[PDB]
């Protein structure tokens, strides 16, 4: 159909634009973690830590934080490929990327993942899920919500192109705080919502609503980064010594 053959376009154009904005995808994600030339050093102790160079807790957190920082800059230039997004209020512009970043990073955060560790410098390390698990309080708390999440959205089996147009339609909510102007925002996300759709149908012809379970899970990220933002406010008061990033807390005054 013309209709359908403009829809698989537009899913093309952003999987194209997605693999030239984020360096590690899932495919490379995966291909490094279930097994010569890929292998990750793993860390799962103290000596493991310290041989990977080759206080503890916040030198891991700030490595995180710098990481995340970093994620946002990459979603920034991601959504300025969605057709439309650029042509809208740059204040809206700003609401999407402050309430739509942290959700995509815990999505593509997911891709790194398995039920026992996450990759991590880009594919070269895998600190593991105890080890994260093991840190001072409240640290140790940190990682276990984005895991449990992982462990049941992977089980979706989506690969690079589905979550190039899942992420896109993330970013475009129309239902986000303080937008100005949300139809031109509804209108964008319908058809991406559309190309999503018709992408699920094509890629997992067996998966019964997929399409339907993948929405569902919109509901599990908004859980996760409304968790996360509550430890924020611990650490702040218990690790006053403790430095975060300006970018970080200028999208968490929500
Ligand atoms: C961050 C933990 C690890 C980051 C993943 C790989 C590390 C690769 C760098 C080499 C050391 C977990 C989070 O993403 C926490 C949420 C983001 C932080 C924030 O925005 O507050």
Redesign the pocket.
């Given at each position: 159909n013309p209709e359908s053959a403009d829809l698989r376009a537009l899913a093309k154009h952003l999987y194209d634009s997605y693999i030239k904005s984020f360096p590690l995808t899932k495919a490379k994600a995966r291909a490094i973690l279930t097994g010569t030339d890929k292998s990750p050093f793993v860390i799962y102790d103290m000596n493991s830590l310290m041989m990977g160079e080759d206080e503890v807790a916040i030198r891991?957190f700030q490595?995180?934080?710098?990481?995340?920082v970093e994620?946002?800059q990459e979603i920034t230039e991601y959504a300025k490929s969605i057709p439309g997004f650029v042509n809208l209020d740059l204040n809206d512009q700003v609401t999407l990327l402050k309430y739509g970043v942290?959700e995509i990073?815990?999505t593509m955060?997911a891709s790194?993942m398995n039920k026992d560790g996450?990759?991590?410098?880009?594919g070269?390390?895998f600190?593991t899920r105890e080890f994260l698990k093991s840190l001072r309080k409240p640290f140790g708390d940190?990682?276990e919500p984005?895991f449990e999440f992982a462990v049941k959205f992977n089980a979706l089996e989506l690969d690079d192109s589905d979550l190039a147009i899942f992420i896109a339609v993330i970013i475009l909510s129309g239902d986000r705080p303080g937008l100005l102007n949300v139809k031109p925002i509804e209108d964008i996300q319908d058809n991406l919502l559309q190309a999503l759709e018709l992408q699920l149908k094509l890629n997992h012809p067996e998966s019964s609503q997929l399409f339907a379970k993948l929405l569902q899970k919109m509901t599990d990220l908004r859980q996760i980064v409304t968790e996360?933002v509550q430890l924020?406010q611990v650490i702040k008061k218990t690790e006053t010594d403790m430095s975060l990033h300006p970018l970080?807390q200028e999208?968490?005054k929500d």
């Open positions: 891991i490595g995180c934080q710098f990481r995340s994620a946002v942290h990073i815990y955060l790194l996450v990759l991590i410098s880009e070269q390390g600190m940190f990682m984005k996360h924020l970080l999208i968490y």
